[PDB]
Amino acid sequence: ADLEDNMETLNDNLKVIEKADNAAQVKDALTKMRAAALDAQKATPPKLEDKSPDSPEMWDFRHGFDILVGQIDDALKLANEGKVKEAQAAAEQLKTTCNACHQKYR
Ligand code: HEC
């Protein structure tokens, strides 16, 4: 799907994690964020449409997602350890990554 769709998926699932009823719901949401994040990483955002694929900007753009996926995976580990609250806390920390990217490229 396109960048926008992927972003909506991330935002939607993040709020799901915050509402987190059970471990299952947090894991499902995190898993969907993982896929959406990796999918988004392959797109070319509007602000960089005129830039080369190998440009420093694009690599920086792609880097933002490497960080997000790492954080998501770490939250996944916590969730699969049965530590649901810590995993939700970790999901909250993710926001810093979202905001950083939006500042430069949104
Ligand atoms: C860069 C590496 C990004 C990371 C990490 C995240 N987002 Fe993002 N987001 C990015 C761009 C360039 C844009 C503009 C997309 C466009 O062309 O319209 C966005 C936009 C959003 C939006 C609003 C627009 C929409 O999705 O329709 C939301 C709701 C959004 N992003 C949420 C979001 C969340 C929750 C993230 C972290 C968990 C996140 N984004 C990361 C680039 C990047």
Could you give all domains of the chain from N- to C-terminal order, each with its CATH number?
1-106 (1.20.120.10)
Query: Taking CA 28 as the corner, what is the angle to CA 104 and CA 84, rounded to the nearest 5 degrees?
Result: 90
Resolution in A: 2.2
The number of beta carbons lying within 10 Å of the beta carbon of residue 80 is: 13
Task: List the one residue out of 34, 20, 27, 5 whose CA is nearest residue 94.
Answer: 34
75: left (phi over 0), alpha (psi -120 to 50) or beta: alpha
Task: List the one residue out of 13, 10, 33, 29 whose CA is nearest residue 106.
Answer: 10
Q: CB under 6 Å to ligand 1: residues?
A: 3-4, 7-8, 10-11, 14, 45-46, 61, 64-65, 68, 94, 97-98, 101-102, 105-106
Contacts of 84 (CB under 8 A, 6+ apart): 20, 22, 23, 26
Closest residue to atom 25 of ligand 1, CA basis: 4
Please, which experimental method was used?
X-ray
The pair of structure tokens assigned to 45 is: 């955002």
Ligand 1: centre distance to CA 95 (Å): 11
